[PDB]
Design an enzyme around this catalytic site. Structure first.
Site, PDB file in Angstrom:
ATOM      1  N   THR A 227       0.824  -1.206   0.000  1.00  0.00           N
ATOM      2  CA  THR A 227       0.000   0.000   0.000  1.00  0.00           C
ATOM      3  C   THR A 227       0.863   1.263   0.000  1.00  0.00           C
ATOM      4  O   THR A 227       0.777   2.094  -0.913  1.00  0.00           O
ATOM      5  CB  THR A 227      -0.926  -0.013   1.221  1.00  0.00           C
TER       6      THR A 227
ATOM      7  N   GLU B 205       7.608  27.237  -0.771  1.00  0.00           N
ATOM      8  CA  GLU B 205       8.863  27.700  -0.200  1.00  0.00           C
ATOM      9  C   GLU B 205       9.815  26.553   0.110  1.00  0.00           C
ATOM     10  O   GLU B 205      11.036  26.764   0.123  1.00  0.00           O
ATOM     11  CB  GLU B 205       8.583  28.526   1.058  1.00  0.00           C
TER      12      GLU B 205
HETATM   13  N1  GTP Z   1       8.643   4.450  11.381  1.00  0.00           N
HETATM   14  C1  GTP Z   1       7.662   3.591  11.171  1.00  0.00           C
HETATM   15  N2  GTP Z   1       7.798   2.620  10.189  1.00  0.00           N
HETATM   16  C2  GTP Z   1       6.787   1.733   9.960  1.00  0.00           C
HETATM   17  C3  GTP Z   1       5.615   1.802  10.702  1.00  0.00           C
HETATM   18  N3  GTP Z   1       4.810   0.816  10.268  1.00  0.00           N
HETATM   19  C4  GTP Z   1       5.434   0.129   9.284  1.00  0.00           C
HETATM   20  N4  GTP Z   1       6.664   0.669   9.091  1.00  0.00           N
HETATM   21  C5  GTP Z   1       7.669   0.247   8.102  1.00  0.00           C
HETATM   22  O1  GTP Z   1       7.035   0.173   6.845  1.00  0.00           O
HETATM   23  C6  GTP Z   1       7.547  -0.891   6.088  1.00  0.00           C
HETATM   24  C7  GTP Z   1       6.381  -1.825   5.801  1.00  0.00           C
HETATM   25  O2  GTP Z   1       5.367  -1.093   5.154  1.00  0.00           O
HETATM   26  P1  GTP Z   1       3.932  -0.819   5.798  1.00  0.00           P
HETATM   27  O3  GTP Z   1       3.546   0.620   5.983  1.00  0.00           O
HETATM   28  O4  GTP Z   1       3.769  -1.576   7.094  1.00  0.00           O
HETATM   29  O5  GTP Z   1       3.036  -1.466   4.625  1.00  0.00           O
HETATM   30  P2  GTP Z   1       1.563  -1.024   4.149  1.00  0.00           P
HETATM   31  O6  GTP Z   1       1.488   0.318   3.484  1.00  0.00           O
HETATM   32  O7  GTP Z   1       0.531  -1.218   5.243  1.00  0.00           O
HETATM   33  O8  GTP Z   1       1.382  -2.067   2.951  1.00  0.00           O
HETATM   34  P3  GTP Z   1       0.782  -3.574   3.087  1.00  0.00           P
HETATM   35  O9  GTP Z   1       0.603  -4.029   4.546  1.00  0.00           O
HETATM   36  O10 GTP Z   1       1.707  -4.391   2.205  1.00  0.00           O
HETATM   37  O11 GTP Z   1      -0.585  -3.538   2.459  1.00  0.00           O
HETATM   38  C8  GTP Z   1       8.632  -1.465   6.958  1.00  0.00           C
HETATM   39  O12 GTP Z   1       9.721  -0.630   6.710  1.00  0.00           O
HETATM   40  C9  GTP Z   1       8.173  -1.146   8.353  1.00  0.00           C
HETATM   41  O13 GTP Z   1       9.261  -1.154   9.216  1.00  0.00           O
HETATM   42  C10 GTP Z   1       5.462   2.783  11.681  1.00  0.00           C
HETATM   43  O14 GTP Z   1       4.422   2.837  12.341  1.00  0.00           O
HETATM   44  N5  GTP Z   1       6.499   3.683  11.909  1.00  0.00           N
HETATM   45 MG    MG Z   2      -0.999  -2.934   5.853  1.00  0.00          MG
END
Ligand code: GTP
Ligand code: MG
Ligand code: ACP
Ligand code: GDP
Ligand code: 84F
Ligand code: CA
Ligand code: CA
Ligand code: MG
Ligand code: MG
EC number: 3.6.5.-
Lengths: 317, 62, 438, 422
Positions: free
Chosen positions: C145, C254
């Site tokens: 996503t 900016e």
């Molecule tokens: N800093 C931070 N990184 C996150 C967080 N949640 C997920 N990640 C990072 O995001 C990556 C995984 O992508 P996600 O955002 O979890 O994936 P998504 O958009 O939900 O996509 P899908 O679950 O594949 O549908 C990895 O690098 C995780 O470590 C968060 O809450 N904070």
């Molecule tokens: Mg997800």
């Protein structure tokens, strides 16, 4: 137990540090491209420093200092000595950087006896300027070894560890063109193993063109009534100190996600008033033959095992 | 080192300090690509539903 | 007054979103029920917070935000969390099944069937705006996503709002907190497809924040909560000028202008100090000069790289707290000498500084301590290309053997969109080399 | 709600399917009557992955029980949780399959599959979001093997965009019903390569060894073999049944675990195989030993393409990573260097019955080829003399179909070998 790769195969010195590491039973070699290593013996060219220190749980250490080319490329070495205020300096020849910066204009301001040297030797600016690369003054009046009326240069091996302690190797080497010295015939003018391993009677007034430090001390006492420490090594230590302390904040890996140590080869000339001169700084030096054993061990001692402990021969500066 | 454009107010201040001077794809092209990937799926699915049908006729011949 | 719309996509974007809007509310004094007592203009205003908050007749202050996840479980916690009364139920958009860490499945398959509904909900916000500036898009490089649906939204936003600015906050993937082996694939794909559509993009490397939480908050195994509350401060520092009376970085145009000379090179490095544990018993408060120097230690950057070995193109300093300019120019003078700060020859060696006198707010009962003064530096340095070579090597290692490619092809994508996306990145690394080394 | 439909087929399928539901019902607090009596709500946050809610607010497994004879089916109903199962979901016939793949796949099983699919469709239709299917079955008999792979082919047709997962018990001379087991299993492997996304190789040879060299049992029963399967199956589904930082599901598991679509054959591993809980260094050492593998291949012979390990109990998350990253950089000769971060770890605070520390491991190793080589050898030894074939040609099969299955499996062994040196 520790991990290391090897990525300059034809390196005389680190081929031996890598061999000594295996023989301690505590270090495992990997392929050139395995990212899960503790130690890298990197490439001479384009070593990817951008990729070190990003391995979770892996302390990483590498045998080069990113930015040490500021000191080892003669174009940037002059630019560093001319531009860095820590270097004003009276031990580096008058030098100019010209392109096939640059400063040909000021290159002639000091031209009223003017004989010079250029490579990367003649008396007239036209002769070498057609090589279309740095221009220094030539040490017209060097120190001569007797009997033989010989030239020579000093190679000193300096180790900088991850803490930036500056370790001068106790052993050095004198490399003579063991033939008498003339004027103006281009044999004893370039005195080493590049216009003497093909053109120039390969080691007359000593052994393998290499006169080590104890022999050269003895001569200085008997011939000059001074010592190696006083007449020369003080200035050598001052020069090693000044260059490395100059770039210290540009290359220090003290608060970095990986860490660096590096072996250097400083090359000096001594003139006839017993004044020491810096020629160039070597970033990947080859050692002299009989010393390989003792230097390649002290590296492991203070640069490698100091980071990755297991179960003196250097002068700290 | 020269300060410039100092802008104050109740919330704070901004300014600049100089130490040395110097010397789109259309919606159609989107639809085109988005839908040529839907064809590539249907093709691969039709090829699957085809191979499965050949497996049914073999099952019936056995 | 000109409004800004925030789009949080994927798990990382939505959970970071939560941290930000909670901090925005603590900063602007908005209660969990949307009520802002200090706001005397009930139901309207062209104030500075109104850039991020519309108001209702009943006096609710409502995030100018749209939350989007292909799967409901994360945004559902917003639907029932502390700030459930804060958002319009129509602002939280959730699909059925997520992208299974698959870029092509977030872009092409499952993406195509919610894109029109999202742009519909975004448009219902763009119509509440008298002069919309553009969008702030929060998402992970790594999710399906986060990477695949975001690049589809960015394509369509350049079309519906060609005259509007788009800033990204992007979470760059880190092994010691990753969730999928294919994250390097998704990263390169979404960067190639999003590049021309984004004006400026702030990369947060999860490894940098994770190590900072370990070293400075003395937390052995940092949670996403710890990671996100820290990222909240950096994002609040960066956006404070859009939400408070100021004269530096007052609109999205900016950020491009002050930080992005070349348009492909739109990834400013962010450094932030100081990060102090709330349970550090005895703590000696740090000075203006002390926190300005920290902005030059790699261990405080949001992306680990060595900026001594590149050239700058712009530097901004955003302070929050007890800071007067004399202190600043002083600290700058001392630092200009002892540090290797090389600009490019076609850029003025110098800083743009901004100060907000209100000190940083911390989430009460959080892990950060209150501090008298903090700074966030936004340098556009070429050293950030180190992160692209790290990512491109991890992509090269797998794609040499074609590992996991079939999962993408299977959703309708072509192997070329891989080697296209990777030749783009190989150009983006060359661009950074032309600008930064001799 | 990402629901899963579970199908057990044949003797081995329904025996090791029963225990699975016995184990995870206990972990989830559901008694032999379908009533929940649990302390934590962690037991109920993802309980729809495997359970349907009843009218009396009871829990009924999303489980379809399938056999071509009712022997094992009646015995399941009389065992512990026998009345937990939806009674409409027992689908069986009477003639059996006689340890004959052709009977399961082409004749006897062809007669019964359409009714099983009526129960799949009934279960599938009442699912908010269906990840796909989990089949338990052996490969050396007739029903689980021949009819099992028939069901897989038909489910892929009705539900081609759902995930197909199997727990697939491999035959072995040490625990052997009949001499024709290599024939049945070579034929089934050809089906599984094509029509599943993830298959757990449960090798009966490994299970017999672990029982005889390690657990100190000099003649192990099928009940001891299946207790090892019970634990592996619980741990390998922990990240599906329990809420984690990891939202694990069958599709994400396949995306992250399978780099090439035919190499989807996983080697499980479990530890420990007592009142002293193990230290995290003992979990890590045992798990990755050849002696804790449920598939009978020395992983020192090939390399791990990918790995997913889960640690269950209350332990040092930092020490897990410390010990995990340790055994990698001690044995990095047996992991591929060209898949970044190919070893993934998680932790679940809830431990399994009567174990304070346990750790289950999913391995996509290329040493799984040694299992296929072993099957392929035993197959050619008979098929070179066309021995025992009359049982199959009597049901309609041609020698051709056999040569094909042999061929596709020897290819499989090649592909697994091309990546062992990459
Ligand atoms: N800093 C931070 N990184 C996150 C967080 N949640 C997920 N990640 C990072 O995001 C990556 C995984 O992508 P996600 O955002 O979890 O994936 P998504 O958009 O939900 O996509 P899908 O679950 O594949 O549908 C990895 O690098 C995780 O470590 C968060 O809450 N904070
Ligand atoms: Mg997800
Ligand atoms: N300033 C100087 N004074 C006296 N002699 C000098 C001199 N500069 C060079 N030389 C002569 O040139 C030789 C030194 O060679 P130089 O230091 O330039 O290394 P090099 O050109 O081989 C680069 P590399 O070793 O990396 O290949 C010596 O024999 C020395 O006599
Ligand atoms: N591990 C295990 N293996 C079994 C069990 N029952 C049968 N087997 C194996 O299953 C194979 C025989 O197949 P079976 O399930 O009895 O055939 P089916 O009834 O026709 O499906 C042989 O390889 C046996 O070793 C069991 O309960 N556990
Ligand atoms: C190799 O790379 C990866 C492999 C697997 C995953 C995740 C993925 C989200 C999914 O599903 N995993 C999973 C992990 C387990 O252990 C970590 C486990 O054991 C119970 C399990 O059971 C279903 C599932 C993520 C990765 O990055
Ligand atoms: Ca107002
Ligand atoms: Ca019949
Ligand atoms: Mg020399
Ligand atoms: Mg049997």
């Amino acid at each position: 137990m520790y991990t290391f790769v090897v990525r300059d195969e034809n390196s005389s010195v680190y081929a031996e540090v890598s061999r000594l590491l295996l023989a301690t039973g505590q270090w495992k070699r990997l392929r050139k491209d395995n990212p899960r290593f503790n130690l890298m013996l990197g490439e001479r060219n384009r070593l990817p420093f951008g990729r070190l220190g990003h391995e979770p749980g892996l302390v990483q250490l590498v045998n080069y200092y990113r930015g040490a080319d500021k000191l080892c490329r003669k174009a940037s070495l002059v630019k560093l000595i001319k531009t860095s205020p820590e270097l004003s300096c009276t031990w580096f020849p008058e030098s100019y950087v010209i392109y096939p910066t640059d400063e040909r204009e000021v290159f002639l301001a000091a031209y009223n006896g003017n004989v010079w040297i250029a490579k990367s030797i003649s008396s007239e600016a036209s002769e070498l300027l057609d090589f279309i690369h740095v221009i220094q003054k030539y040490l017209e009046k060097p120190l001569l070894l007797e009997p033989g009326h010989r030239k020579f240069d000093i190679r000193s091996w300096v180790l900088v560890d991850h803490l930036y302690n500056i370790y001068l190797y106790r052993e050095g080497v004198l490399r003579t063109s063991s033939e008498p010295y003339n004027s103006a015939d281009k044999t004893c003018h370039l005195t080493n193993h590049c216009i003497q391993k093909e053109y120039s009677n390969y080691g007359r007034y000593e052994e393998g063109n290499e006169m080590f430090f104890e022999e050269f001390n003895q001569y200085l006492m008997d011939a000059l009534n001074t010592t190696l420490e006083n007449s020369i090594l003080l200035q050598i230590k001052h020069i090693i100190r000044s260059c490395l302390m100059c770039i210290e904040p540009a290359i220090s890996t003290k608060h970095l996600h990986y860490q660096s140590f590096q072996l250097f080869g400083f090359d000096f000339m001594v003139d006839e008033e017993l004044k020491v001169w810096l020629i160039e700084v070597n970033g990947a030096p080859a050692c002299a033959q009989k010393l390989y054993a003792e230097l390649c061990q002290g590296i492991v001692d203070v640069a490698i095992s100091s980071v990755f402990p297991l179960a003196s021969i250097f002068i700290k500066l | 080192m020269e300060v410039i454009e100092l802008n104050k107010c109740t919330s704070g201040q901004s300014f600049e300090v100089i130490l040395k001077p110097p010397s789109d794809p259309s919606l159609e092209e989107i639809q085109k690509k988005l839908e040529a990937a839907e064809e590539r799926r249907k093709y691969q699915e039709a090829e699957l539903l085809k191979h499965l049908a050949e497996k049914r006729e073999h099952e019936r011949e056995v | 007054m000109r409004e800004c719309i925030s789009i949080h996509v994927g798990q990382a974007g939505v959970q970071i979103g939560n941290a930000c809007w909670e901090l925005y509310c603590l900063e602007h004094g908005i209660q969990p029920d949307g009520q802002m007592p200090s706001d005397k203009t009930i139901g309207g205003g062209d104030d500075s917070f109104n850039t991020f908050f519309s108001e209702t007749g009943a006096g609710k202050h409502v995030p100018r935000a749209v939350f989007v996840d292909l799967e409901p479980t994360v945004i559902d916690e917003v639907r029932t969390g502390t700030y459930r009364q804060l958002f319009h139920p129509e602002q939280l958009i959730t699909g059925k099944e997520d992208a299974a860490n698959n870029y092509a499945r977030g872009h092409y398959t499952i993406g195509k069937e919610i894109i029109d509904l999202v742009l519909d909900r975004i448009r219902k916000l763009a119509d509440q705006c008298t002069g919309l500036q553009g969008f702030l898009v929060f998402h992970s490089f790594g999710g399906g996503t986060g990477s695949g649906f975001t690049s589809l939204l960015m394509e369509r936003l350049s079309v519906d709002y060609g005259k509007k600015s788009k800033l990204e906050f992007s979470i760059y993937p880190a092994p010691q907190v990753s969730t999928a082996v294919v994250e390097p694939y998704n990263s390169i794909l979404t960067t190639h497809t999003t590049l021309e559509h984004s004006d400026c993009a702030f990369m947060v490397d999860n490894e940098a924040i994770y190590d900072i939480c370990r070293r400075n908050l003395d937390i052995e195994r940092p949670t996403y909560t710890n990671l996100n509350r820290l990222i909240s401060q950096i994002v609040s520092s960066i956006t404070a000028s859009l939400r408070f009376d100021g004269a530096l970085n007052v609109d999205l145009t900016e950020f491009q202008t002050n930080l992005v000379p070349y348009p492909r090179i739109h990834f400013p490095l962010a450094t932030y100090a100081p990060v102090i544990s709330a349970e550090k018993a005895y703590h000696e408060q740090l000075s203006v000069a002390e926190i300005t120097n920290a902005c030059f230690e790699p261990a405080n950057q949001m992306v680990k790289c060595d900026p001594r070995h590149g050239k700058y193109m712009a530097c901004c300093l955003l302070y929050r707290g007890d800071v007067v300019p004399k202190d600043v120019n002083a600290a700058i003078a001392t630092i200009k000498t002892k540090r290797s700060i090389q600009f490019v020859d076609w850029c003025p060696t110098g800083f743009k500084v901004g100060i907000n006198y209100q000190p940083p707010t911390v989430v009460p009962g959080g892990d950060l301590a209150k501090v008298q003064r903090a700074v966030c530096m936004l340098s556009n340095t070429t050293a950030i290309a180190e992160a692209w070579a790290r990512l491109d090597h991890k992509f090269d290692l797998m794609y040499a053997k074609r590992a996991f490619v079939h999962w993408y092809v299977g959703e309708g994508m072509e192997e070329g969109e891989f080697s296209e996306a990777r030749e783009d990145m190989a150009a983006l690394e060359k661009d950074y080399e032309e600008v930064g080394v001799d | 709600m990402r629901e899963i439909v579970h199908i057990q087929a044949g003797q081995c399928g329904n025996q090791i399917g029963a225990k699975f539901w016995e184990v995870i019902s206990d972990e989830h607090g559901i008694d032999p009557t379908g009533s929940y009596h649990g302390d934590s709500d962690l037991q109920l946050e993802r309980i729809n992955v495997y359970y349907n809610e009843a009218t009396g607010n009871k829990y009924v497994p999303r489980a379809i029980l399938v056999d071509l004879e009712p022997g094992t089916m009646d015995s399941v109903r009389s065992g512990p949780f026998g009345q937990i199962f939806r009674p409409d979901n027992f689908v069986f016939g009477q003639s059996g399959a006689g340890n004959n793949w052709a009977k399961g796949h082409y004749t006897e099983g062809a007669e019964l599959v359409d009714s099983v699919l009526d129960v799949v469709r009934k279960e599938s239709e009442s699912c908010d979001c269906l990840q796909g299917f989990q089949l338990t079955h052996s490969l050396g008999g007739g029903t689980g093997s021949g009819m099992g792979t028939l069901l897989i082919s038909k489910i892929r047709e009705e539900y081609p965009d759902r995930i197909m997962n199997t727990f697939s018990v491999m035959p072995s001379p040490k625990v052997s019903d009949t001499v024709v087991e290599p024939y049945n299993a070579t034929l089934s492997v050809h089906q599984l390569v094509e029509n599943t996304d993830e298959t757990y190789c449960i090798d009966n040879e490994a299970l017999y060894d672990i029982c005889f060299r390690t657990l100190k049992l000099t003649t192990p029963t099928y009940g001891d073999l299946n207790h090892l399967v019970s634990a592996t199956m619980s741990g390998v589904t922990t990240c599906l049944r329990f809420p984690g930082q990891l939202n694990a599901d069958l599709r994400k598991l396949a995306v992250n675990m399978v780099p090439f679509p035919r190499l989807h054959f996983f080697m499980p591993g479990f530890a420990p195989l007592q009142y002293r809980a193990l230290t995290v260094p003992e979990l890590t050492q045992q798990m990755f030993d050849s002696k804790n593998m449920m598939a009978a291949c020395d992983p020192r012979h090939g390399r791990y393409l990918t790995v997913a390990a889960i640690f269950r109990g209350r332990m040092s998350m930092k020490e897990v990573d410390e010990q995990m990253l340790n055994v990698q950089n001690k044995n990095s000769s047996y992991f591929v260097e060209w898949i970044p971060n190919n070893v993934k770890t998680a932790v679940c605070d809830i431990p399994p019955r009567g174990l304070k520390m346990s750790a289950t491991f999913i391995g996509n190793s290329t040493a799984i080829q040694e299992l296929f080589k072993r099957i392929s050898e035993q197959f050619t030894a008979m098929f070179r003399r066309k021995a025992f074939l009359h049982w199959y040609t009597g049901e309609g099969m041609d020698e051709m179909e056999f040569t094909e299955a042999e061929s596709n499996m020897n290819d499989l062994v090649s592909e697994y070998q091309q990546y062992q040196d990459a």
